[PDB]
């Protein structure tokens, strides 16, 4: 009984590769996940970042439900890995190559399975995976989270992002080591420590209210943030690199941090331009 | 109408995993061919290697034909890409899949069909490739050719083997070159000629009649040889290099070098257990 299906749209994937490109050795070894309503699901690939970090690419509008299923109009969640046990077959390297030109991912069972099925330039070739969904345990949670508010949120320039990455990495040891990140409102000043060393960065505390990252970027020049209340943060150093790279997506995303509610510091492609509409990407660093 | 089917024998592919491993990087540009009489088809990979060379790898007794097919019972020749175009499917880096349980190719028309049928551990994943037979301009050659006779043949030990090689490496330059190899009936000596440099081997020449590599090898101590007239090839020093490579499977294969009646210089992988059976690796050298 083939439950529910829907149609992967290649040429949006097409326009949205650079960033899954970038991504691809952190999300070989991921969960993808098909959730959201029954209508306009989400295409969502998760997967661990170093020791302490979650990995999450979220595309909207990229699937259209197939005619004739049993699901109504609720909400739908399944969670698989997008590399099958012993398998040659990625998900996502299929769905977003090159040379595709139909796509369909299929749900059914009678065990649950899922079928993925390829279509290449040649209206000849093609391919059709066939694996289990067994990673329900994984929800979709990166969109979940009370953001706005007057959340503390810090926004670096170019020069200042490279330059912490660069400090950060040769920091590194063969262990993985906490870094300890804290924002202090009294002095506009954030501060990464570890080891027996600190890398000390100021920013330009925004005054009026603001939701989001529109009007807190983009100054290239000058590093930004919006802080009411000091922040402590202790992270796996190999998850923040990893982070920090992942959301410097050339011509799509620059990195924005945000201390949450919660114990969690997100690192988030913050867009440098209006083609990444319907991507979001980020890693949560969980504290240590 | 599916006219022809196979199913392979996966425990057979395991025990010869090793050489297809080694061999892996040359043959996934390849080509895939089913080939020899319909009751007993040869399963067999080839693929340039270097400016002049052609590889092939050959595998008996791992197909059984599936019951009613239109080919009666005569000869069957079928040959396909092994990673068709804009692929992640590679036909051989699933075969011999680690994680491998049920395997078969089957080839159908009503243009010309191959879909190739994975089936994985969990008796759960599964992946069927299917693409379009058009290397017909590609004949199974390799067992093909007039030795035994008197023909010109070396073998050479581990030791001077692998000083041939490292030498063979340190003269070339970004520019393929052509190393010209000779043989002389006179003083049982092979020599390895290019840029302004030769590397000179002598050999015992064997009065005794002999067919085969048997009788020949292998006395891991001096290199051995049969020669009834001088001979000279041009070959390319990249598709040398590749050939003695592939040819030395470290616990299967030790490379033997033939002249053939044509102006072909084989490099073939010599057996050095009974493991290897049902498998024989090879690479032509075109003069050049």
Redesign the interface.
């Known amino acids: 009984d083939f439950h529910y299906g829907v149609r992967v749209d290649v040429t949006l994937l097409s326009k949205i590769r650079r960033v899954n490109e970038h991504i691809k050795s952190a999300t070989k070894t991921g969960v993808v996940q098909v959730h959201g309503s029954a209508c306009t699901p989400t295409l969502s690939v998760l997967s661990s970042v170093g020791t302490a970090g979650v990995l999450g690419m979220r595309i909207k509008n990229a699937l259209t439900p197939l005619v004739g299923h049993t699901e109504g109009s609720g909400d739908v969640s399944f969670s698989f890995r997008n590399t ?7 998900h996502t ?2 769905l977003f ?4 030109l139909d796509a369909g991912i299929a749900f059914y069972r009678k ?1 649950q ?1 899922v079928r993925t099925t390829i279509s ?3 209206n ?9 969904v067994d990673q329900k345990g994984i929800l979709p949670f990166h969109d979940r989270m009370e953001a706005g508010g007057r959340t503390t949120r810090l926004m670096l320039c170019g020069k200042t992002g490279a330059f912490l990455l660069k400090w950060l990495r040769q920091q590194k040891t063969k262990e993985d080591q906490t870094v300890t990140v804290s924002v202090s409102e009294t002095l506009s000043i954030v501060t990464f420590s570890l080891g027996g060393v600190s890398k000390i960065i100021d920013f330009k505390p925004e005054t009026k209210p603001v939701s989001g990252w529109d009007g807190l970027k983009g100054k290239k020049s000058v590093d930004v943030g919006v802080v009411h209340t000091d922040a402590l943060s202790r992270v796996s150093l190999e998850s923040l690199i990893a982070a920090l790279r992942m959301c410097k997506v050339p011509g799509w995303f620059t990195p924005g941090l945000i201390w949450h509610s919660n114990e969690i510091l997100e690192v988030e492609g913050v867009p440098t331009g209006c083609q990444s509409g319907d991507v979001k990407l980020s890693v949560l660093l969980l504290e240590v």
Chains 1, 2 share one sequence.
């Open positions: 099958s046990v012993g398998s040659g077959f990625t390297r299929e190559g090159a040379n595709v065990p399975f290449y330039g040649d000849l070739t093609s391919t059709v995976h066939k694996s289990v």
